[PDB]
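Journal club prep — side note

Before the paper discussion, L.F. wants everyone to see what a predicted structure for a comparable chain looks like in token form. Sequence:
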Amino acid sequence: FGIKVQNLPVRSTDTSLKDGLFHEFKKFGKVTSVQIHGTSEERYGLVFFRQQEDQEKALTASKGKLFFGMQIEVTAWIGPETESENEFRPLDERIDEFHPKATRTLFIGNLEKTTTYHDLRNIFQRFGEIVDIDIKKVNGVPQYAFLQYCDIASVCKAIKKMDGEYLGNNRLKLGFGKSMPTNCVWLDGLSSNVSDQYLTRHFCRYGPVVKVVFDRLKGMALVLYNEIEYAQAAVKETKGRKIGGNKIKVDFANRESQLAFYHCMEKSGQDIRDFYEMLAERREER
């Protein structure tokens, strides 16, 4: 039932603005209260209406409205339930593994101060193999975390099940986290008939491919470059597309992700030894 009025003149006193806002907005209907919350240019007014019909009239009619010489910006003041709906409504079904924002990284926002790595593993290990978890502090205290899984499906499942669920006193705000750019591309969804020849030749369009590491039991591959920029181009240009001849999932792979990938191939008996790498080891021993 309130509106929020921004871009008020800094030379006016709080009282002047309070009285002015009241006088201006009472024209739309009965006004319940007017509050000024400073200061300077973050200074804004709240005008509360008895009837929501009046609030709507005032919002609709005050687009590009001049007030005390200023083109004020006036928006609905969001009540707690509407905001909860805003901040927690069911995710759009368009959001799946192939969405341009989808990554292997779960953003976990709204953490409480006391949040521990053990808590996060306890809730989020159910949705997939965790590669790493990084809790970050905002202004000094834990506020959010990046939790990286081995694939994208796991992030989607975690979001679906846990978004808006409480952890301690706080509702989790889950989403796709951006992944830090690296020089290594990760691909998922490759048929076992895809050849290394094809992958190397295809990804060479983005720059010289240092090597490809194809886990053919899992249908995943690393495509490694010597430049972060090439991997960035490969990721960006591959995101929408088919890599022969299936819609592919694609992300960056950081060091921890690569290590997990290699271990997994070793455990399954797939060779990860590389030509140029052995040559290097030969070089050192000389």
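L.F.'s comment for the group: The longest helix spans residues 255-267. Keep this in mind when we get to the figures.
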